[PDB]
Amino acid sequence: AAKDVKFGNDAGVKMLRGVNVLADAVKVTLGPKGRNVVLDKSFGAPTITKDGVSVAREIELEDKFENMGAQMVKEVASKANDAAGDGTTTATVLAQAIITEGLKAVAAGMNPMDLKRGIDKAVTVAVEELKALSVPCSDSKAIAQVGTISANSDETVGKLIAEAMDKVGKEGVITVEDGTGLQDELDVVEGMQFDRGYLSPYFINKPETGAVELESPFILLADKKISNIREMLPVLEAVAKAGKPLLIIAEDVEGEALATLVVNTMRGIVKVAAVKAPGFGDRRKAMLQDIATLTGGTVISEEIGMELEKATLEDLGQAKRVVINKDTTTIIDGVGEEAAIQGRVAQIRQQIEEATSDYDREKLQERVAKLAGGVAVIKVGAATEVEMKEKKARVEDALHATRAAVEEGVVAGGGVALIRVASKLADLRGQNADQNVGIKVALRAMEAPLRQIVLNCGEEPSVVANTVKGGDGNYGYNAATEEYGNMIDMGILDPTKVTRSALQYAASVAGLMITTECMVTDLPK
Amino acid sequence: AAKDVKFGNDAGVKMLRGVNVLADAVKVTLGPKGRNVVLDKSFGAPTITKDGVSVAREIELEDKFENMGAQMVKEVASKANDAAGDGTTTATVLAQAIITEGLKAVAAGMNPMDLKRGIDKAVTVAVEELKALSVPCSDSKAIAQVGTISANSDETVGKLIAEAMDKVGKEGVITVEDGTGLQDELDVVEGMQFDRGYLSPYFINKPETGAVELESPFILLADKKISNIREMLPVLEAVAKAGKPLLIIAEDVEGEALATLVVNTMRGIVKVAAVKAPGFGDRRKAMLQDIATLTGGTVISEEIGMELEKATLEDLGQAKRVVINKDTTTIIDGVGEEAAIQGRVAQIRQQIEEATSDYDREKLQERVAKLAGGVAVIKVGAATEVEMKEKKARVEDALHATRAAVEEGVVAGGGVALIRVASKLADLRGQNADQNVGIKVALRAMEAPLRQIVLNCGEEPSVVANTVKGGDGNYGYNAATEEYGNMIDMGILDPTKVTRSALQYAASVAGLMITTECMVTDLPK
Amino acid sequence: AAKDVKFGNDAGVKMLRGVNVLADAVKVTLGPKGRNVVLDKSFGAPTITKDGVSVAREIELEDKFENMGAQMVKEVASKANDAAGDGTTTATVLAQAIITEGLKAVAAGMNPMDLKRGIDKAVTVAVEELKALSVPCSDSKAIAQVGTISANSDETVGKLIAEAMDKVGKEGVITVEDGTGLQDELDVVEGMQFDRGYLSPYFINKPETGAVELESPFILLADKKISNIREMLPVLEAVAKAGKPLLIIAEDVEGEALATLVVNTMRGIVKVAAVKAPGFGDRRKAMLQDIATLTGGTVISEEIGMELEKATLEDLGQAKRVVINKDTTTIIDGVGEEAAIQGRVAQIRQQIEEATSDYDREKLQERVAKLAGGVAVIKVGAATEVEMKEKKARVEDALHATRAAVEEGVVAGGGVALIRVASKLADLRGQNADQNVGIKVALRAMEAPLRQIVLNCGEEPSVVANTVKGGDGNYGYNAATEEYGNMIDMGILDPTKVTRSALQYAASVAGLMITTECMVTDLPK
């Protein structure tokens, strides 16, 4: 279709405008004094929220070029979301600040490539220095503290997460499920988790977590690619009965078959989700088997001349619950018998003995750990379905934050970590003056989060920014009480990982937009 | 429908505007400091690319005449791409440069035909001069160097390519496949490659390479054209079982049959790809047999009263893997037994003895080389599926570039080769003044690539151009470091083949546009 | 009337647009290869000029804000013109260069006050550096050389000027008049020149020189202010007869009387011009008397109870010719008798003896020097009225240039002086980054003159600028022959005074525009 094509500054003003509409809508919701954003709905009362992600997903602009700018930033923020699980508003505010001054520098005649290089050098040095501000979170006491703080001061949620990590290790798998009613429950079941997400959205039955969740489903373990639905027809119907959902763990589910699954499960016609088998090559088959041994299923490989048509509900594996993200599948409590499972473990355990290569050794140890590690499960307390569903949400978030904190620690919140780091980089220089402008653009943007938080309070950004910059260490501004103090002692913490991610993703998009010379989009016809 | 018709100048300004929009969008991506171009998508985030071809594909204009000019010059990139697989952006800026000055000369009253003749003469001599400057890439050391340079300084990839060419010769067939995991693998198998691509896209299952790849497929060797699907029905079903893809190597697959194959394999209903048989006439049949002997199949020719209906999976040939490009089919590791194959070789070997004509002699030697040469297979190292898939890409590109280098050598990159050539042609003249202007148009356009590379750096084109022209030999401008020096010593080389192709296709399309007097298109209604 | 009021950016873009129209129209006329500009006339053929001042005078824009910007920068040329009588085009291109980059920096957010401070510092140091590079023009050989060069290599005009200055001193008064025919004439007459211009234009009968010229006029020396025309009526009529013009040298001619004089002399009704009396206070009267003694007139002061009504043509002084500029009156050849004049000299000469103060002593020596110095008169050769009128023009210009050269020396022309100065200031810095940007804005603007000269040649500005900057000293580009060489040896020189003035006035007006925040003008109604 005929295209509209814009160059240089023409494209620049358009991108900046789109970015500003997105960032301005989103940023009003940052921090304890975040304001409400009303999102219209075709049916019912409008949604009223302080959650930046919800606001962002609704942002689409009429002007084609402006919409492109908006969509570009949305992407990165969501990426920060995927990587750290928090800080999308922070990232969006950092991105607007870098893009705004960067595009201005470009209109001023500065070399885009150099501006980008300066920005990148500042970020690289900045994340390194952010580590110096970090407070580790290794012992259970620390884990408990972070969890409590992340759970709105609920020392209960804190103890739960700490105990859970104490069971399966802070690097282990942990899940949360509705409780049986009153009093929490923590138990380790036979489970496993591999790096493979849904073969397409839609399967996502819980957009709240943007994941797919199945209860007591059957697990088809096909050691091959599935293109023709015909092969599935027999098994899909066998599963149609028994009224249980089906999880497809094949080498891959291609267009034809996948398309059908997406349409059928879209019409309530049998609930089925598909994900690729873990690993590739040889180890793939070996791993697909570990899953079988765990779920009590039977691998259907063509190597042994087996057909999916000739597959009954007896071949299928089974587990009490399975959850799959954008890129992760977790099987909770499989039917497999400890006899077969523990035996399988013994086998692989000898494999490691006969290992003649570190690589093969590592890969084997990975399997035993997965098959012998299990899955810690947290069943949230209760006393009414409403409160139970609520506390469950808190435990979910607290857990998420604590996990990030365990990986890279926590730093002062309220935007002080980033501003503290920027205030110590004023002497940083690059190869030339344009690169030096880039560095300054970056150091300046690092103050935007704190500034927006204060602005949302109804206070003066520059005055508070100044005062914070004047102190040192964790000295900062508490936006909830409007008093200065030690951010760590006041319990205003951000996982180091989310702060670093927000900055790197913001810088990354900004760098791309700053070095964009031409935009192509459909004509507004 | 009713047409809009434009003549001379009216048509010229339209064409020029159309080529300018396309060329301007494309040329910003040229070189190490190429800028980003954002391409809108109907869903999700826009595409951000520094790839010229990707930009060109999206260019379509509203004004019917301007669109014609854009689509015409777009042919330059596509042909240069098909012929050399690189240098499409370079070819596009050369075309714009030639078209711009050429149309100006026409508007000035100069004879279009003479202008074109002059341009052609300059290009003819320029190509000869380009060959003269070309540095060979014959020994394994040179091959290793080029490979390393093309692999982003990865001396590993360099060694691999060098060893692969040492096995099957620099003219031999070489492929790259995913590795078994960690450490590369190089092995020669029974294989062959002939000049015939897919009989239509869609068969392309891997758009990343725009090629078709089949694993352990059956190979139908039919010595005749296939129009009716009926004939295939019996064999297609036999192949439906055993769950293996099918490669059709017939004299040709016409509409009816082809259309069906495209639709069926489009629905996952049996994976089948079709390509014409190598050569034509008599040699065609002899060659179709060489493939049979290699894949252990049986030629199904009507000459012996054979029917496709009466063809079983036993007649079909087979190989571990086959890959087909837009114009190349490569069969890797065929089932044929060394007894039959090596025997077939002996036969053709005598054919050469009894050869009473050089032509027949050449053609025969070509067959023995293909059948006795084999196929070197490069299995890329690993250590995680992600890195493995990445390194595979690099090896593929490095191989492609090194192959080109071996054919015609290499010349200084950064646009300096064309500048040196242009300076050597300063005294070139034609039959008249208009032809002389055409020659000058071409020599001037030869500086465009270096000038655009510099412009993208944010430096001054005329100053750098002036300085490079000031020195000589491999003296050029390194746009990555913004330092002058010896292009070869700095490792900035271009295969002579891509430079030559870019120039010839640019001059070719430019010549046509310059000699265009009238344009016809549908009325904007 | 109602006003239109604009602020910041809105006002800025308007001013920039206005200076760009003016500067672009003017700068095309710069240097040896300056282009022609056609200026429409209400009647007859249009004016075709390469004179920057002629072009600037015609520039007026429709948009009220754009017009203001144009008229403001137009002040640059006029002031530089009044100060050095040359380099108005150079001054305009320097102003546009400073304004353009300065307004960009303002739009980029830099502090306007600091940008101006940085620009001002750079110009201050640049002027000092300019004086350091200046070569003196003190001896008659140098004076002859400069004159020759300024007269288009006419060694004749060079000798004439050298001799004239040798007569009355290089600081003495010199005039040029039509010759009697063939062969030049140099003689000194009883004359004097004081710092007082016409009390209003209109009196200007020769717009070519923008000055007023009277031949054999009567000189009224009234020692008081004249407000009522009544007083003049009697004398004006006495002068109405004898058919001679009248020069009014009173303490001042105020509104009423002045207005009448402007109207009457506007209708050919008696030619009269008025100028204030030299000096002020006491010395004023004494000086007004020196003029009387020189012109043979009689001071009409009220102190002795004298009335202008009772003044006859006998009281009026007289001289063969008088010329008055915007701020200078020169009486050439007065009627006064050498007896009275030389006697008056003796008087003042004793005054100097009895002087008890240096100040009084200096002031007295100034008077004797004026009254005893006379006025050198150069009568241009001939051989046909046409050639005579021409040579006269050259002598006038060569004289003007040589005068400037004597005052401050000469520097390489072709814009190389400013380029050499700029390079010597590469390390100049201010109090902060914004001031440093200002400094760079100024150093960059200094290359504008040379670049525009090259541009008008049809050559590449950056290439030539680069080459010139590459060399040093008087190495420069000769735009007439398009060859590099020693500007001095090639005779391409500019009086340090015009280069200095162009730079200071440009920076002065640029600094004012850069620090303007609001513009007020009438509503376009």
Ligand SMILES: Nc1ncnc2c1ncn2[C@@H]1O[C@H](COP(=O)(O)OP(=O)(O)OP(O)(O)=S)[C@@H](O)[C@H]1O
């Ligand atoms: N009392 C407080 N004073 C100052 N800042 C606080 C306080 N409590 C929390 N914060 C900060 O507020 C920020 C988090 O606010 P949110 O509104 O959740 O936005 P976000 O995490 O950047 O993006 P979302 O949540 O993905 S939308 C972090 O910088 C917190 O440290």
Ligand SMILES: Nc1ncnc2c1ncn2[C@@H]1O[C@H](COP(=O)(O)OP(=O)(O)OP(O)(O)=S)[C@@H](O)[C@H]1O
């Ligand atoms: N450091 C360098 N300095 C100068 N030129 C370089 C450098 N590195 C690569 N080049 C040149 O850049 C050109 C290739 O740039 P590309 O952006 O890949 O465009 P292209 O190959 O013309 O078209 P594509 O790649 O098909 S879009 C060749 O002239 C290279 O020699």
Ligand SMILES: Nc1ncnc2c1ncn2[C@@H]1O[C@H](COP(=O)(O)OP(=O)(O)OP(O)(O)=S)[C@@H](O)[C@H]1O
């Ligand atoms: N052969 C030459 N090569 C280079 N520059 C020259 C040459 N001859 C004169 N110039 C320069 O041209 C400039 C003077 O050009 P003009 O066009 O007269 O403009 P201007 O004096 O700046 O303004 P006007 O004359 O008042 S409009 C000075 O910088 C001279 O040194």
Ligand SMILES: [K+]
């Ligand atoms: K919020």
Ligand SMILES: [K+]
């Ligand atoms: K590129």
Ligand SMILES: [K+]
């Ligand atoms: K001029």
Ligand SMILES: [Mg+2]
């Ligand atoms: Mg948050």
Ligand SMILES: [Mg+2]
């Ligand atoms: Mg390329």
Ligand SMILES: [Mg+2]
């Ligand atoms: Mg001049």
